[PDB]
Amino acid sequence: SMSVKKPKRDDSKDLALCSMILTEMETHEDAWPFLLPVNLKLVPGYKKVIKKPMDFSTIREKLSSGQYPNLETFALDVRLVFDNCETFNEDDSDIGRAGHNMRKYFEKKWTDTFK
């Protein structure tokens, strides 16, 4: 509360560390469905159904331009990428499996880097 604060967690490396995680997600072999925004002119139903499209290139641009206020807003966009994927793709599809694999990969890096 006013003049009463928990000890200051060092967040000075968060930007660099989120960048490194995102590099590792970008270079994973199952990243291909997530590298670029879904083409809303060419994928029937996507625009209406997926209210907040997100992809790795959009996260990279947001990260590089200071549009994440803190490391949690960064994790929320990464998770959005996989939540969107689950919303639109059957579990038993290449893209559906890709999304589950990448979410697992992300969550482990996230825990090991920050928890």
Curated annotation (Swiss-Prot):
The record's account of tissue expression is: Expressed at varying levels in several tissues, whereas a smaller transcript was expressed specifically in testis.
Domain Bromo per the UniProt entry, residue ranges: 9-113
**Where in the cell?**
Nucleus
What superkingdom does the record give? Eukaryota
Q: How does it assemble?
A: Component of the BRF-1 ISWI chromatin remodeling complex, at least composed of SMARCA1 and BAZ2B, which regulates the spacing of histone octamers on the DNA template to facilitate access to DNA. Within the BRF-1 ISWI chromatin remodeling complex interacts with SMARCA1; the interaction is direct. Component of the BRF-5 ISWI chromatin remodeling complex, at least composed of SMARCA5/SNF2H and BAZ2B, which regulates the spacing of histone octamers on the DNA template to facilitate access to DNA.
Family membership: Belongs to the WAL family.
Function of the molecule: Regulatory subunit of the ATP-dependent BRF-1 and BRF-5 ISWI chromatin remodeling complexes, which form ordered nucleosome arrays on chromatin and facilitate access to DNA during DNA-templated processes such as DNA replication, transcription, and repair. Both complexes regulate the spacing of nucleosomes along the chromatin and have the ability to slide mononucleosomes to the center of a DNA template. The BRF-1 ISWI chromatin remodeling complex has a lower ATP hydrolysis rate than the BRF-5 ISWI chromatin remodeling complex.
Q: What is this protein called?
A: Bromodomain adjacent to zinc finger domain protein 2B
Look up and give the organism this protein is from.
Homo sapiens
Organism classification, top ranks? Answer: Eukaryota, Metazoa, Chordata, Craniata, Vertebrata
Gene name, please? BAZ2B
